[PDB]
From a paper:
SMARCAD1 is a chromatin remodeler, a member of the SWI2/SNF2-like family of enzymes that couple ATP hydrolysis to repositioning, ejecting, or restructuring nucleosomes. KAP1 (also known as TRIM28 and TIF1β) is the major interaction partner of SMARCAD1, with the two proteins forming a tight complex (Okazaki et al., 2008, Rowbotham et al., 2011). The SMARCAD1-KAP1 interaction is direct and involves the first SMARCAD1 CUE domain (CUE1) and the RBCC domain of KAP1. Remarkably, CUE1, a canonical CUE domain, recognizes a cluster of exposed hydrophobic and surrounding charged/amphipathic residues on KAP1, which are presented in the context of a coiled-coil domain, not in a structure resembling ubiquitin.
Crystals of the KAP1 RBCC ΔBBX1-SMARCAD1 CUE1,2 complex were tetragonal, and diffracted to 3.7 Å resolution. The structure was solved by molecular replacement using the cubic crystal structure as a search model. Similar to other TRIM family members (Goldstone et al., 2014, Sanchez et al., 2014, Weinert et al., 2015), the biological unit is a single, elongated dimer, which is symmetrical in the tetragonal crystal form (KAP1 RBCC ΔBBX1-SMARCAD1 CUE1,2 complex) but slightly asymmetric in the cubic crystal form (KAP1 RBCC-SMARCAD1 CUE 1,2 complex), suggesting that the coiled-coil domains may have a somewhat dynamic structure. In both cases, the dimer interface is extensive (∼5100 Å2) and formed primarily by the antiparallel association of the coiled-coil domains, with some contributions from the RING and second B-box domains. The majority of contacts (i.e., ∼520 Å2 of a total interface area of ∼600 Å2) are between CUE1 and an exposed surface at the C-terminal end of the long arm of the coiled-coil domain of one KAP1 subunit, but the interface also involves the RING domain of the other KAP1 subunit of the homodimer. The α1 helix of SMARCAD1 CUE1 overlies and buries the exposed KAP1 RBCC hydrophobic cluster that is comprised of residues I338, L376, M378, I379, and V380. Thus, CUE1 α1 helix residues such as Q163, T164, E167, and L168 contact the exposed KAP1 RBCC hydrophobic residues, with T164 appearing to be particularly critical. The CUE1 α3 helix—despite containing the conserved di-leucine repeats, L195 and L196—contributes only minimally to the interaction interface via contacts with the peripheral charged/amphipathic KAP1 residues (e.g., R330, W333, and T334).
Residue numbers in the entry:
A (entry chain A): 59 to 94, 113 to 137, 209 to 409
B (entry chain D): 151 to 198
Amino acid sequence: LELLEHCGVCRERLRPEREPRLLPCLHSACSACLGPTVVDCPVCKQQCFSKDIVENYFMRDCNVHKHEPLVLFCESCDTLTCRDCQLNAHKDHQYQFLEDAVRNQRKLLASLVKRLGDKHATLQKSTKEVRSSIRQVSDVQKRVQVDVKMAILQIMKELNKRGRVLVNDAQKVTEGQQERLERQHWTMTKIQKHQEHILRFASWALESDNNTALLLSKKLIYFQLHRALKMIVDPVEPHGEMKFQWDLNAWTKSAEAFGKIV
Amino acid sequence: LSELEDLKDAKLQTLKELFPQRSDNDLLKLIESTSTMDGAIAAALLMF
Ligand SMILES: [Zn+2]
Ligand SMILES: [Zn+2]
Ligand SMILES: [Zn+2]
Ligand SMILES: [Zn+2]
């Protein structure tokens, strides 16, 4: 559109005076734009030696025989010639007129274009497929990135549920044992002070033995009565065996195995 | 093997469509080093 008509570096409108030349890549730029062996395209490559550059013939709205123009098509040389060239150079070279050779060429280029156009219709469709596929690949990367993380947390959520419950189990056992122990230190010290008191008073009374028998022998009944209180005090300490060292379930080798796969 | 030649030369003309400045001799060595996969040639092309 706005560029097909325009030239190369200067992007002039096609001036036929400009002697514009059309490269094999079909790009067009006047010989003023590019002077310098093998000539290279401003966009593509040096696809062909300068010997394969035509001059663009676009002048909107013969090589040899001067003002005699070309109108006629030499069928034996793929290109056009004037009436003279087919008398000297192409004598009885089987030859054809412009009107028929152009009809066929137009109908073969329309075929090449109609098929090639049907082909670039699929790139216009497969470009969108690749464009949407990339977003999928990166979405299917950041969703697998989250499925693993949320699955790991669901495991750890339930494990801490059955990790704290076992801790609450040990919690229960110890206040139950402590309540038992606290009645066994309470029991000891109070019985001990009862034992201490009888031992205290009976010792002092017995230890004073210098003409003190008259005071002692009047209280023998209550001495030996309260000795029966301490003859049978009736507690014996039990021992709660420690088994919490063996209520830790250390199956460590199993933990790595199931962590290895996932 | 004349079929095999055109299937090789087909892939060559496309590198010139993409990266053209490098020579026709250089691209031919890479389209054998790749075994004429349509994509993996354009892979090694960018690498050099
Ligand atoms: Zn120009
Ligand atoms: Zn070009
Ligand atoms: Zn001829
Ligand atoms: Zn002539």
